[PDB]
């Protein structure tokens, strides 16, 4: 019979044409299409449809297309689009996007999504489901930061470091075979996908290759170790021979050469740039031109994003503290002026808005906060929507295009950059099961349910002593997927092809699923989704002005922003 839209949305979820607002921001997502058919919606509970002899099948065994887990009536939002559908995962792999139910009594059920006796049901009605966020700048300094990362729907930490060490604090590297083997062995206890980056400096091919053959997944070229052009050349040779990605922390003192010298040293190859904006480091002041090349993949760290009325002072103070800068020497003042430059941040706002920068990262505990990458990404999105207004591709008064572009910056684009695209990074069949379920009113603050490999790993859950799970205090707790030996099965540890073939996991006794990094040196800025624009970036050496397409880019810092004290205790 006739059903009013409001009741249907309240009981099942939004339909075609409905708009949902992401937290306190001013962003509305409109459901483009829908795969389920009205009247055949599947839900669980007492007296519901999913029962033996009903929309739940009861004859087929596990092998005959019977699923192992299904999220019902979820609202998928990925670079492929935004639509409401049902998610079906089996053996820890996403196997079906569509509608789930018994084809015996329902119509239009996708053949691979048969639900039977050996299935689990999770009701994601009125919840936003996103792929696990990918972090590319993590300084491994504290083992309790994995929980903070998990609280924001981050399932892949890609970095180096051996704890509270001097080099580990300064740079994200894992120098040598011994240290990288120790880190790989210690990786067993972390309930997260992990990738390890080794030191990418030296004067010979063999010492650099020894790290890749030991189990490294990439290379980092940090300034404090010495970013000489010879080191860049050696690292690039090792990389394209071994098919791994290289991350560059460009020189800031210009002691070994200007930006053009490094640009010639890379020689038109494919490289990944860390903190391309330049607050965290880089060639003062024209580093940001790397955002314009058609062969360099850009990125950004969080503490500068977005532009508020307090970034400059805190950044100056942390530069004062970490590097032991003093106010009795004017060289430190000159360094601060030449590093922290507000015009470049005001430009980076628009370049993030315009799709010039394709990714976004954290640089955890290294002038960057681990647990607010998605938070700050969506804050920047809302601020840019408020200031620069609607984009040119908007239709019917909806923000689908902006949402897709900004959600591509921390889920899929880093996966393309690091070469791990074919296992993780998006909701797509054949990929691993790393999903994050948010409530619409909490989207971007606290992940409601983080599931890795088909088993729920993290959840905002209440007191354990109550008869029901909701009663206060609700807090983030690790579920059964991060205890016992189950942690070894729901996690993927990424590893180079050459070091995988050498039986490194067997020698080390690795037990987690081993991931292979491939298809990394064949890509560029032309392959990123919605963020594939390359142009000329002009940096004025004196006025520090930024000009793009013959136009100056700047924006005014805001005093108040959403995604803020309304949610956090402090």
């Amino acid at each position: 019979m006739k059903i009013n839209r409001q009741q249907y949305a309240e009981s099942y979820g939004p339909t075609v044409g409905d708009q949902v607002r992401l937290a306190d921001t001013d962003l509305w997502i409109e459901v483009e299409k829908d795969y389920t058919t009205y009247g055949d919606e599947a839900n669980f509970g007492g007296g519901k449809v999913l029962r033996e002899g009903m929309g739940e099948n009861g004859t087929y065994t596990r092998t005959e297309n019977v699923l192992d887990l299904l999220l019902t009536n979820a609202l998928i939002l990925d670079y492929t689009g935004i639509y409401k559908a049902d998610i079906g995962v089996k053996d820890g792999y996403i196997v079906g996007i569509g509608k789930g139910g018994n084809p015996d009594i329902m119509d239009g059920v996708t053949p691979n999504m048969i639900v039977g006796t050996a299935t689990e049901v999770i009701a994601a009605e009125g919840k936003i489901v996103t792929a696990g966020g990918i972090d590319t700048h993590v300084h491994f300094i504290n083992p309790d930061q994995v929980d903070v990362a998990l609280a924001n729907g981050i399932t892949t930490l890609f970095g180096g470091g051996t704890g509270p060490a001097e080099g580990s604090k300064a740079t994200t590297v894992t120098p040598g075979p011994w240290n990288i083997e120790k880190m790989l062995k210690s990786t067993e206890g972390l309930p997260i996908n992990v990738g390890i980056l080794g030191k990418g400096h030296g004067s010979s091919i063999a010492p650099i290759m020894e790290q890749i053959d030991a189990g490294a997944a990439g290379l980092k070229i940090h300034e404090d170790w010495g970013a000489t052009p010879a080191s860049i050349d050696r690292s690039l040779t090792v990389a394209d021979e071994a098919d791994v990605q290289v991350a560059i922390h460009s020189d800031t003192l210009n002691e070994a050469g200007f930006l053009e010298d490094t640009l010639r040293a890379i020689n038109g190859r494919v490289i990944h740039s860390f903190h391309v904006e330049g607050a965290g480091g880089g060639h003062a002041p024209d580093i940001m031109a790397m955002a314009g090349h058609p062969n360099v993949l850009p990125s950004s760290t969080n503490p500068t994003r977005p532009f508020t009325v307090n970034t400059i002072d805190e950044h100056l103070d942390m530069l004062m503290v970490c590097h032991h800068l003093k106010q009795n020497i004017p060289e430190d003042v000159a360094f601060a002026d030449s590093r922290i430059r507000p015009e470049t941040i005001a430009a980076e706002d628009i370049l993030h808005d315009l799709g010039i920068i394709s990714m976004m990262s954290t640089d955890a505990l290294a002038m960057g906060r681990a647990g607010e990458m998605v938070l700050r990404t969506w804050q920047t999105a809302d601020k840019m929507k408020k200031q620069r207004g609607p984009l040119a591709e908007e239709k019917n008064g909806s923000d689908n295009f902006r949402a897709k572009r900004y959600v591509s910056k921390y889920t899929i684009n880093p996966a393309i950059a690091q070469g791990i695209a074919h296992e993780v990074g998006s909701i797509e069949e054949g990929k691993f099961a790393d999903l994050v379920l948010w409530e619409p009113k909490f989207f971007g603050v606290k992940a409601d349910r983080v599931i890795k490999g088909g088993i729920i790993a993290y959840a905002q859950i209440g007191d354990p002593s109550a008869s029901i799970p909701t009663p206060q205090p609700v807090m983030g707790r690790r579920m059964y997927g991060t205890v016992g030996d189950l942690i070894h099965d729901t996690n993927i540890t990424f590893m180079s092809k050459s070091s995988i073939q050498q039986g490194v996991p067997a020698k080390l006794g690795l037990k987690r699923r081993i991931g292979t990094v491939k298809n990394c040196r064949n890509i560029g800025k032309k392959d990123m989704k919605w963020n594939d624009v390359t142009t000329d970036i002009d940096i004025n050496p004196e006025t520090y002005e930024v000009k793009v397409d013959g136009e100056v880019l700047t924006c005014e810092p805001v005093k108040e922003l959403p995604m803020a004290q309304r949610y956090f205790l402090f």
């Binding site: 109550a466 206060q472 205090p473």
Partner: protein, 100 residues
């Protein structure tokens, strides 16, 4: 003292409640987490006093008014449920739309 983990967990609720009370007494508008803390702490204290479940539910809706909290917070909380040791055992107290 002999504390099961439950008491150690509710002590955090009490701490958040007293912090929220200090913030409110200063003259600020509360946001969602500490408003939840105040409501649940009032529920727990009223249960410890010796009130019944029905009267606790009734007075749970008249502790915070909608102009003591941040803008739009009243829509955060559909209901609040808590575990409280009444004079005749532990019980679950649930109050719907506590702020209006």
């Amino acid at each position: 003292m002999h504390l099961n983990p439950a008491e150690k967990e509710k002590l955090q609720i009490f701490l958040a409640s007293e912090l929220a009370l200090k913030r409110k007494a200063r003259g600020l508008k509360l946001n969602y987490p500490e408003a939840v803390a105040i409501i649940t702490s009032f529920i727990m204290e009223g249960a410890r006093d010796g009130k019944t479940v029905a009267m606790l539910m009734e007075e749970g809706k008249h502790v915070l008014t909608r102009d003591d909290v941040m803008e739009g917070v009243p829509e955060m909380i559909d209901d609040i449920q808590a575990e409280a040791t009444f004079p005749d055992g532990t019980k679950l107290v649930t109050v719907h739309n506590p702020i209006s």
